[PDB]
Design a protein around this ligand. Structure first.
Ligand SMILES: *[C@@H]1O[C@H](CO)[C@@H](O[C@@H]2O[C@H](CO)[C@@H](O[C@@H]3O[C@H](CO)[C@@H](O)[C@H](O)[C@@H]3O)[C@H](O)[C@H]2NC(C)=O)[C@H](O)[C@H]1NC(C)=O
Lengths: 43, 49
């Protein structure tokens, strides 16, 4: 048996709700500069 | 104006809000069905004379 513990972090997150309402893709705004631009551009 | 919708609500989710933070779809508490919310028609009135 294997169990992980991915401690959560309070961090802004760009959730891409699909046509169906389920988050399909995403961007972690604080991950790297490219991700941060995507969040600022909201794209 | 209400109308039957086709938005799958999750068991814990009851209200669906709009960009302006306005509910544009609701789930009826009695019958678990999804309704569609749309503001009643409006518009400017112009008098031609
Ligand atoms: C959200 O749900 C709708 C409806 O299922 C998805 O719409 C797209 O609709 C067409 C026609 O239904 C799908 O083609 C196929 O439909 C048949 C049933 O009609 C199904 O058995 C097939 O497996 C196939 O799905 C089309 O695939 C479907 N889109 C997708 C990605 O499956 C809509 O796509 C759903 N949104 C997402 C992001 O999945």
């Amino acid at each position: 048996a294997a169990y992980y513990v991915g401690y959560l972090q309070p961090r802004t997150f760009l959730l891409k709700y699909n046509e169906n309402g389920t988050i399909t893709d995403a961007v972690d705004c604080a991950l790297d500069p490219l991700s941060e631009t995507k969040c600022t551009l909201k794209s | 104006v209400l109308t039957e919708s086709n938005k799958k609500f999750l068991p814990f989710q009851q209200f669906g809000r709009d960009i302006a933070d306005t509910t544009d779809a609701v789930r009826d508490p009695q019958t678990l069905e999804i309704l569609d919310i749309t503001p009643c028609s409006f518009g400017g009135v112009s008098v031609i004379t």
